[PDB]
Design an enzyme around this catalytic site. Structure first.
Site, PDB file in Angstrom:
ATOM      1  N   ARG A  24      -0.864   4.500 -42.189  1.00 52.32           N
ATOM      2  CA  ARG A  24      -1.683   4.598 -43.719  1.00 52.32           C
ATOM      3  C   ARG A  24      -3.239   5.153 -43.571  1.00 52.32           C
ATOM      4  O   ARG A  24      -3.561   5.793 -44.320  1.00 52.32           O
ATOM      5  CB  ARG A  24      -1.818   3.060 -44.084  1.00 52.32           C
TER       6      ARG A  24
ATOM      7  N   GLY B 291       4.278   0.554 -44.443  1.00 54.35           N
ATOM      8  CA  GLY B 291       3.665  -0.583 -44.040  1.00 54.35           C
ATOM      9  C   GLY B 291       2.578  -0.512 -42.916  1.00 54.35           C
ATOM     10  O   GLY B 291       1.400  -1.317 -42.955  1.00 54.35           O
ATOM     11  N   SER B 292       2.863   0.278 -41.849  1.00 49.60           N
ATOM     12  CA  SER B 292       1.889   0.397 -40.715  1.00 49.60           C
ATOM     13  C   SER B 292       0.574   0.882 -41.065  1.00 49.60           C
ATOM     14  O   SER B 292       0.384   2.005 -41.593  1.00 49.60           O
ATOM     15  CB  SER B 292       2.708   1.116 -39.765  1.00 49.60           C
ATOM     16  N   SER B 293      -0.327   0.144 -40.459  1.00 48.10           N
ATOM     17  CA  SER B 293      -1.719   0.351 -40.808  1.00 48.10           C
ATOM     18  C   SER B 293      -2.120   1.615 -40.210  1.00 48.10           C
ATOM     19  O   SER B 293      -2.860   2.466 -40.779  1.00 48.10           O
ATOM     20  CB  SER B 293      -2.743  -1.000 -40.277  1.00 48.10           C
TER      21      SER B 293
ATOM     22  N   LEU C 297       5.738   4.718 -40.800  1.00 48.08           N
ATOM     23  CA  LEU C 297       6.303   3.807 -41.674  1.00 48.08           C
ATOM     24  C   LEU C 297       5.139   3.401 -42.793  1.00 48.08           C
ATOM     25  O   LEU C 297       4.154   3.209 -42.436  1.00 48.08           O
ATOM     26  CB  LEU C 297       6.944   2.596 -40.999  1.00 48.08           C
TER      27      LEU C 297
END
Ligand SMILES: N[C@@H](CCC(=O)N[C@@H](CS)C(=O)NCC(=O)O)C(=O)O
Ligand SMILES: N[C@@H](CCC(=O)N[C@@H](CS)C(=O)NCC(=O)O)C(=O)O
Lengths: 207, 207
Positions: free
Chosen positions: B13, B8-10, B6
């Site tokens: 990313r 948004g997930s750090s 996803l």
């Protein structure tokens, strides 16, 4: 090499087992944390985060138990069997090491530490988080003898420090058949299990 | 190589920046956590822990972001600059990765997740612990442009996903001179920072 350590500390006991499994002699040095000895400028200079275990290897400072396990095997292990070169096998062992830290031992700390260090009463939603961790480990262990691959690795050794912390704190994990069978086997085959078990009795005193 | 993620997930990313850094095109598969997709037998069969990010690379399943970083660099990296062969260099990177997960991101998650996901009020004691983590990162970076050597590594990239998370959550880290400088330089030299920053605005919707 130097190892700043307390015998009761689980991540210390994992380093100590790996150093025994590869036949590496460490210069062991107690660090009295309840005293605040670790906060000294003496030790901050070695490790600014002031944590145990820390290794000094001919002046190279290193902390984080699981980074140390990797480095001791890589630099010093005669065979690479505790941490094989094959990136897939390594990658499974790394995942099991992050699991041990952020899922397993983290759930364990989270439930038990506030009881023993701040007196708060058992929180049953942290109990469940803890059991959900062990259940994951049970699942990882399905049809397997060891945690990663078909062989004793640093993943087993780390998880062995953690799961002996579970037992001494009173958590019966017999209901998780695979974990119990892996635990029983891991005690028989891991070098320095007996030293780890001795160290768990210092850890037991917290309870 | 498939990557279930996803934006948004750090931890997702962090993987997508490393892939960019080495020139690897992943098949990015949006896995809808908000609708229970990860909990279905098909994803549970790939990763029984049912967490993202999860790599599937020619049949080989793997999870834990920081295991994935190493695996991608070892397999696909043109050179080893992001993760060098030398056990001592490797060991400083590994310690920062365990630091990233277990100290820095952990403090961040403990302080902010109960607020955005459970709507608990802010806990000022968990705030303090999160600030102590950032201070340790400041110390690590004294005299250094990078987190673990003279060069950019997987340690900066992981840390960059975490610290940009801190940014859109509203945490003010203006006060840490070393963190500031490192963060500004890292946004400049790290491949795929722009896409990371885009994914952070998705995470920021939770606030
Ligand atoms: N993630 C670390 C955990 C180390 C740790 O938790 N150390 C504690 C044991 S009580 C400690 O030194 N606490 C005192 C302090 O942080 O100043 C590792 O695996 O080595
Ligand atoms: N320590 C892990 C964390 C990954 C993680 O926690 N992922 C969450 C992101 S919301 C997840 O998939 N949670 C859903 C679940 O645990 O079922 C890593 O770095 O990869």
């Amino acid at each position: 090499a130097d190892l700043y350590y307390l015998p009761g500390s689980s991540p210390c006991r994992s380093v100590i087992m790996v150093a025994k499994a590869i036949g590496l002699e460490l210069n062991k040095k107690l660090l009295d944390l309840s005293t605040g000895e670790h906060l000294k400028p003496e030790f901050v200079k070695i490790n600014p985060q002031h944590t145990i275990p820390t290794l000094v290897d001919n002046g190279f400072a290193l902390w984080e138990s699981r980074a140390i396990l990797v480095y001791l095997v890589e630099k010093y292990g005669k065979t690479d069997s505790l941490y094989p070169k094959c990136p897939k096998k390594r990658a499974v062992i790394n995942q099991r090491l992050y699991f041990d830290m952020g899922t397993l031992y983290q759930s364990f700390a989270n439930y038990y530490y506030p009881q023993v260090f701040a007196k708060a009463p058992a929180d049953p939603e942290l109990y469940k988080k803890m059991e959900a961790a062990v259940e994951f480990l049970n699942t990882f262990l399905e049809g397997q003898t060891y945690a990663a691959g078909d062989s004793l690795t640093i993943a087993d050794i780390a998880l062995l420090a953690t799961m002996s912390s579970f037992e001494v704190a009173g958590y019966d994990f017999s209901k998780y058949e695979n974990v119990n069978k892996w635990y029983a086997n891991a005690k028989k085959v891991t070098p320095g299990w007996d030293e780890n078990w001795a160290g768990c009795q210092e850890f037991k005193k917290y309870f």
